[PDB]
Structures are given as structure tokens and as C-alpha cells.
Amino acid sequence: QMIDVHQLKKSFGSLEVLKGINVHIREGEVVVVIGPSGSGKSTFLRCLNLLEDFDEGEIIIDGINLKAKDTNLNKVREEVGMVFQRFNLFPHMTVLNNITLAPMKVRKWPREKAEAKAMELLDKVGLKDKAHAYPDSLSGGQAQRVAIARALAMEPKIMLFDEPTSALDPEMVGEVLSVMKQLANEGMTMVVVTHEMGFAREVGDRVLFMDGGYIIEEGKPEDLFDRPQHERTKAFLSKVF
Amino acid sequence: LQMIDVHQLKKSFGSLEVLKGINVHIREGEVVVVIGPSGSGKSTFLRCLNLLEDFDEGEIIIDGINLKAKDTNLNKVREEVGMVFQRFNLFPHMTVLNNITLAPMKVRKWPREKAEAKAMELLDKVGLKDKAHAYPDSLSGGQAQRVAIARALAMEPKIMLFDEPTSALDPEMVGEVLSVMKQLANEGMTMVVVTHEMGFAREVGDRVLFMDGGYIIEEGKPEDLFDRPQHERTKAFLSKVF
Ligand SMILES: Nc1ncnc2c1ncn2[C@@H]1O[C@H](COP(=O)(O)OP(=O)(O)O)[C@@H](O)[C@H]1O
Numbered sequence: 500q501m502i503d504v505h506q507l508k509k510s511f512g513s514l515e516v517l518k519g520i521n522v523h524i525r526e527g528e529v530v531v532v533i534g535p536s537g538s539g540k541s542t543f544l545r546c547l548n549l550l551e552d553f554d555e556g557e558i559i560i561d562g563i564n565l566k567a568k569d570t571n572l573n574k575v576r577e578e579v580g581m582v583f584q585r586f587n588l589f590p591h592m593t594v595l596n597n598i599t600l601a602p603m604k605v606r607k608w609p610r611e612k613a614e615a616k617a618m619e620l621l622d623k624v625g626l627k628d629k630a631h632a633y634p635d636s637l638s639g640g641q642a643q644r645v646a647i648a649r650a651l652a653m654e655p656k657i658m659l660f661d662e663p664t665s666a667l668d669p670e671m672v673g674e675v676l677s678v679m680k681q682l683a684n685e686g687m688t689m690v691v692v693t694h695e696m697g698f699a700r701e702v703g704d705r706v707l708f709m710d711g712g713y714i715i716e717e718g719k720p721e722d723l724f725d726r727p728q729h730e731r732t733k734a735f736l737s738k739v740f
Numbered sequence: 741l742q743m744i745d746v747h748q749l750k751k752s753f754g755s756l757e758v759l760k761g762i763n764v765h766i767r768e769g770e771v772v773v774v775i776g777p778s779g780s781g782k783s784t785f786l787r788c789l790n791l792l793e794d795f796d797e798g799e800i801i802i803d804g805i806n807l808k809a810k811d812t813n814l815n816k817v818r819e820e821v822g823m824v825f826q827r828f829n830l831f832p833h834m835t836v837l838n839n840i841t842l843a844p845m846k847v848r849k850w851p852r853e854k855a856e857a858k859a860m861e862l863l864d865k866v867g868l869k870d871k872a873h874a875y876p877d878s879l880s881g882g883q884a885q886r887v888a889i890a891r892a893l894a895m896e897p898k899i900m901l902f903d904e905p906t907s908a909l910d911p912e913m914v915g916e917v918l919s920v921m922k923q924l925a926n927e928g929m930t931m932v933v934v935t936h937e938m939g940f941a942r943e944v945g946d947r948v949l950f951m952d953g954g955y956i957i958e959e960g961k962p963e964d965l966f967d968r969p970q971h972e973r974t975k976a977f978l979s980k981v982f
Pocket residue numbers: 511512516534535536537538539540541542543873874
């Protein structure tokens with residue numbers, strides 16, 4: 500009941516990007532999403548984060564129905580964090596200020612409280628000493644960890660990841676995946692669009708393969724990667740792994 | 741008149757002096773390149789000019805306005821001073837087009853129709869009008885940085901600050917960005933550019949400032965400072981990838 504989607508459809512003009520998506524993710528589940536570009540993976544995530552609107556079907560995030568009147572969108576918005584492939588940081592402010600901005604403005608937390616918690620989070624990602632540094636001095640691996648710390652600072656119940664390490668140098672991937680695994684080990688509800696097989700196998704509860712606007716196949720990590728049942732899945736897997 | 745005026749500017753982070761007192765005067769139309777080793781205060785200096793950070797001593801005046809003058813007119817400076825960073829220039833949670841129109845609409849009350857109109861032209865100006873409806877996660881470094889520029893220009897600023905806009909790009913994409921900056925320069929835009937791309941400096945730089953440890957060690961026209969450096973430290977820094 501954490502994330503419930505029924506026959507979701509979305510189009511950009513006369514190009515149908517999502518052609519009827521069905522997904523039901525319960526609290527604590529870690530769902531990995533794979534598939535070629537153009538399959539609507541990001542669009543799907545963007546819909547769950549209220550960053551994009553959808554045409555048909557419906558979405559229910561932890562009870563609250565997104566297209567129902569009443570509701571209150573901004574409440575859902577804040578219990579769902581998101582980490583993108585790139586960016587995620589204000590280059591004009593310190594690491595610390597990047598993390599406390601939303602908790603102060605949206606949760607009206609006094610600066611001292613927000614910072615004490617930011618420091619804690621920064622410490623848990625191994626970067627407490629980067630607190631007063633600006634984003635430019637950080638490496639790709641540190642920057643993405645700060646970006647996760649920032650999304651976590653709002654204390655969300657759902658964490659969305661859109662290829663968080665695909666743009667990183669191989670050496671930087673690990674430090675980022677580790678934080679994600681800890682987040683997984685700690686029971687967070689996660690949806691992760693990634694092509695990092697290792698991560699999927701270790702903490703992924705289920706893998707959904709998206710292609711051409713549909714979820715072509717599902718399964719436990721090793722079942723889908725090693726025993727793909729659909730022809731399209733096998734073809735795509737052999738182009739990546 | 742003089743666009744940027746900086747009398748013995750000093751900055752300290754606690755008991756650690758970053759800018760040991762520097763003097764700079766940039767007039768309307770000037771392209772000043774700032775080079776120097778890391779940890780010399782190049783970035784701190786830019787953040788001061790862009791009200792992003794506070795300075796201890798000296799004074800600063802951006803187009804008449806004295807940055808720390810009582811009955812403030814400094815948020816009209818913010819709209820006149822545009823800046824592009826090395827990384828993190830765009831919001832990934834929104835489209836290209838929406839990144840560019842966010843400030844004009846918000847800060848200057850521009851009507852959605854108007855804002856998106858000039859935005860499309862700017863995108864065209866950087867060779868990316870078809871990316872108007874794309875998301876940042878799909879662009880290349882070169883493109884992303886050309887869009888970041890278009891974004892800052894959306895506010896029609898008087899001054900453009902660039903903090904190593906290509907230092908994080910693959911050699912292949914460095915060119916398209918410098919080219920967009922080359923263009924801004926030809927059009928008479930007042931610019932302060934921190935870079936290590938000496939070719940750009942030579943071709944577009946009116947003046948070059950060599951910073952080292954919080955001080956401006958050497959100044960002068962590009963060709964003179966590049967070919968015939970007068971100071972040892974300037975020679976030493978320029979010897980790294982000669
Ligand atoms: N605003 C838009 N207008 C038109 N087409 C769009 C728009 N946004 C995205 N698209 C296109 O629709 C499809 C969306 O794909 P996407 O959600 O990015 O899936 P993926 O994350 O697997 O690449 C792609 O073809 C994308 O380029």
C-alpha cells in the first residue's frame with residue numbers, strides 16, 4: 500500500500516510514453532527498474548514525484564490519491580525524496596545550507612535544529628567535514644552522496660533514484676551504492692532506476708523491466724537477470740550485461 | 741563610469757585570510773580572465789561580486805551601486821549579475837525551458853508567454869532550441885553548460901561571471917561552451933572569467949589577472965602575460981601543461 504499505480508498512461512503530444520503501467524510497491528520494498536532509453540522510466544518516476552502529470556489511470560502514494568480532489572499535493576511531495584542522475588545541489592551555497600534549505604522553509608525547523616540533523620546525515624555518508632565547503636570542491640562520488648543527504652533531510656518515507664551513478668566514473672560508483680544499500684538495509688521504500696547489476700542482486704527485492712512504454716516482465720533479481728522469461732528482456736539484457 | 745570597482749578587498753573565513761587585499765577596476769565592455777592555482781581565492785572573489793558571500797574590508801561597487809551601502813539597492817545587482825558555475829547549473833526536476841524562465845517570471849514578473857519566447861531564442865542562440873522540452877539528465881556536459889549560460893542570460897544581466905565553466909568537461913565538449921562565451925564577448929558583454937583555457941583568454945581576454953594565495957601577483961594583456969610572464973610564480977603556474 501506504499502505505492503499503488505493502475506493502468507497509468509502518459510503522452511507528450513501524440514506520442515504515448517507510458518501505455519498502461521501497473522505497479523504495487525509495499526513499504527520496505529526495494530524495486531529496481533531497468534530498460535532502454537525512451538521506455539518512460541524517468542517519466543514514471545517523475546509522475547510519482549508530482550513533477551509531471553499523467554493522462555489516464557491513477558496513482559496512490561501511501562493512501563493519498565494524486566488526482567482526487569481534497570488530497571493536498573504538497574504533503575505527498577514531501578514524504579517522497581528523489582535523487583537524479585545529475586545535479587541535485589545548489590552550486591551557490593555550502594553543502595550544509597544545501598541540506599537545511601527545505602527542512603527550514605518547508606518544516607519551519609529552527610536553523611540550529613536543521614543543522615544538527617544535517618551534520619548527522621553528512622556524518623552518516625562520511626562527509627561531515629564537507630559541511631562548509633561549496634559543491635565545486637566535491638568529487639562526483641561525494642556530490643551525489645550530499646544529494647542523497649539532502650533528499651533524506653526531509654525525512655521521506657519513499658526514496659526515488661533515477662540512475663544516481665550512471666554519470667559517475669567507475670571508481671566513484673561504490674561509495675554511492677553503499678549509502679543506497681544502507682538506506683535499503685534500513686527498510687526504506689525505494690524505487691531505483693539503475694543498470695548496476697550488483698546492487699540489484701544484493702538489495703533489490705524485485706526488478707521491473709520497462710520497454711516501449713510497458714512493464715514487459717518482473718521478477719526477483721536473480722530470476723530476471725539469469726532466467727529471463729520474455730524474449731525482449733533477454734535481448735535487452737544481452738546489450739548491457 | 742566603470743562597471744566593477746574593488747578597492748583593497750579583503751576576505752577571511754575565521755582567522756584564515758582568503759583574499760589578502762586585491763584591487764580591481766573593470767569598465768563596461770571588458771572581458772577580464774582570472775587565472776591561478778586552486779586555493780587562491782578565485783571563487784571566493786566571484787561570490788563576493790555576486791553578493792553570494794560577504795567581505796570584511798575594502799569596498800565594492802557594481803554599476804554605481806556600492807554593494808554594502810545603507811539603503812540597499814542590492815537585489816537589483818543580483819538581477820544585473822549573472823553567473824555560471826563549473827557544475828550544478830540546472831534543476832534536474834524540471835525541463836530546460838522551465839529552468840530558463842524560472843527567474844524572469846518569478847523575479848521580474850514576466851508573463852509565461854513572454855518568458856518562454858525569449859527563452860526559445862536564447863536556446864537557439866546556443867544551438868539548442870529543440871532541447872527546450874528535454875530534461876537535464878539527458879543533456880551532455882557541453883549542452884548542459886550552454887543551457888546554464890542561456891539560463892543566466894534570461895535575466896538580461898549587465899555582468900556575466902563564469903567560474904571555470906569547462907573545467908569539468910571532456911576535452912570534446914569544452915569547445916562548444918567556449919564558443920558561446922566567445923560570442924558573448926564579441927557582443928560587448930562585461931565578463932569576469934575564471935578559467936584555465938588559455939586559448940580563450942588570448943582570443944577574447946582584454947586583460948588577464950594571475951591570482952596566487954589571495955593576491956593578484958601579475959596583470960596585463962594576455963599575449964604579454966602568457967608569452968613573457970614577469971613574475972616567477974606566474975612562470976611556475978604557467979609551466980603546468982606549458
Ligand atoms: N516534454 C516532452 N515533450 C515531448 N517528448 C518528451 C517530453 N519529455 C520527454 N519526452 C520523450 O518521451 C519519452 C520519455 O522517456 P523517459 O521518461 O526519459 O524514459 P527513459 O528514462 O527510460 O529514457 C522519450 O522519448 C523522451 O525524449
